[PDB]
């Protein structure tokens, strides 16, 4: 019912496990993975085990189905997936942040492609575990721009103080890149 | 079950919150976000909290999952998302309307691309909160056209008075741009 | 559960309303839109109202969500959408049929592109409300062809009399356009 | 719930009807289409009729919604669709098989495009009602190849006798077309 | 409800059967395929048979619907599909591994395309039944690289010992291919 989980393919295991656990908790099945094993198994417990195993099988890619082929419970599958991918880092936060700080808008590139690159970098940083607020995102975006946008920078800083987000800043930046391109 | 909600990525928070609230109300779960906290928690209340948290987790992008990683209720998640994005403007309505009023059909561009641009502008204006009626949409579309369409403008104004919408006007405009292109 | 309804964007309102009404009737909820308002509201009636409003919200585009933002029932939303789009025509049937009758296969164009154009025209005509039988579709397709296909026309007319549909006719036409292209 | 049915657009009516009947039988609703009309209608029968009509409406294209606009039961809709498309042939099996037997791999074309063409032809033949076994598919694929693959043909014939399918044969053929392209 | 199963088209039958069996077990229906035939049939057993047959029909391609057209139970359908595809090999593991070991990064190709090719090869190997650990994947990826990456190889080997996976290794490799391309 929750088709918003990307199948696990060895990348971003923390997000996949979080979404899988949320989905299992939605179906009142997470007690199999988390709760203690009951002394006597009931029909409800067997149904919950089947549902958890089926969900994990559904949200595993064809390459990773070998983790569920053996007659093991969903708890064992998650334990193995943890032992292989639990504490392992997804990327280098310092490298990504160095790339982000070195980002600069080029004359040939338009603001749409630059915004896409900035969004990809920010999304990768946030997926890696870094915590970036909206103000920090805006500051990075503004420092990754040439000096032709100083007018809109001043206007945003002085006027839109209680109304600033990434979307509004990007919209204003595109609005004035239209004028900047016209004035060349 | 409601897969028509775009995951939240920091853009158009009002629409996302409205759709999420509608979906939660559909599942008889919105009482968690809206209703007062009961003195004693029951199994039904815990199930509702789990369902609301799972829904919000499902309809949040991978970048924004940090708002739900902490052991907080769905109400707290929505409160934080509001504190970051509730009253913030999505775009500049005056800038969008200035761009729309300055729109003009060029000789190289066909009516399909012009209609797509007009539709994108109108959709952005409506998402920003502006209220545009069908007559206003038609008036903008007609004033964004050259003088070669005056015949169809007069025919639509005089004949199709109780039958005018954007779709019919666009269809007639394409029908006569065929003839205009033939007569060149 | 019925994800086969295109969200309403101001085009083809009759089809959208028909599909929405069918979906509401499937969920035993159409009594809210159609049935009379009960003297005393019950929990079942409130649940039905919530479900209908949530369904209509789900199957409305982001541009048209303003019809549901106000605290109004699903019946009121449908009444407003009717008052704006109920009896309004979708396109010009005479113009579409004139374009269809004037369709002719060109030497440069292959039969696949011609079939796609013919299918698009027929689909638009049927969506506009016109009633076209299979024999009429076949007749239009055959009269929109050059004289190189007279052999297959005669073979289809004489042999396949109780076995003729658009798909079979198109398949035979492609089969012999292979030979016609070979014989040039 | 069964979103694997392509909406009916006048092509492949047998497959669409088979899938629709299977879906209706899954929901315990096929008794409306198949079973006799009860003397007295009940709430369950009306619910089943609504569900069947809604399912058929959902899995009908916008062009074919005119078959359900009138206040008719799902049984009547299926009866009309049968009267228009039940016994009519989908394509010419002899023509498709003549095209398949005449298929030959060209020097310019790679094995991927040839395999795609062969798969499309086989799929069309199977949809038309023809019965082709795996051995026949393999024989057609092998006879549609040049003499440069005789080594792999002999190896497959002699060694892989209890292990031959279309996928394995295609994989071996690509494996040795790598070598054949290298040896040129 | 489980839309993550690719319809069966004669390729990768083991994965399709595993996913179908998991889905059937989720719905408490696998007892039809696995359990013994009861002496007396009940309404529950007939409902389970209908559900299993409908699921198998849904997750079968249009080419393979002939396995279910006849009035046979889901158990018979699976038995026939096994008799045609159960023990048959999907590809040549030795050929795939020879291709993987011979993989080498070329100057023209970027690391993204090379990573895509490596991922495709590894996925095909894992689908064929081979068991490859994360360390083996990393070793193959590293031996499929030129000598310009020896610095990052040494850094990963010495520093990231308890933190190594394919994703992190690929990210570091791209990070330093940026520098390598800059230094040319």
Residue numbers in the entry:
A (entry chain A), B (entry chain E), C (entry chain D), D (entry chain C), E (entry chain B): 3 to 186
Paper passage:
Here, we show that the Ty1 retrotransposon Copia forms virus-like capsids in vivo and transfers between cells. Copia is enriched at the Drosophila neuromuscular junction (NMJ) and transported across synapses, and disrupting its expression promotes both synapse development and structural synaptic plasticity. Because Copia behaves in a viral-like manner, we used cryogenic-electron microscopy (cryo-EM) to determine the high-resolution structure of the Copia capsid and found that it is distinct from the related dArc1 capsid, with a larger internal capacity and the presence of pores similar to those used by retroviruses to carry out their reverse transcriptase activity. The capsid layer is composed of the Copiagag protein’s CA region, which contains 2 alpha-helical domains.
Local reconstruction of the pentameric capsomers found at the vertices provided a map to an overall resolution of ~3.3-Å. The high-quality maps of the locally refined capsomers allowed us to build an atomic model of the Copiagag protein with high confidence and good stereochemistry. We hypothesize that the pores in the Copia capsid play a similar role. Despite the less extensive interfaces between capsid subunits in Copia, we observed an interesting interaction between adjacent CTDs that is not found in other retroelement-derived capsids.
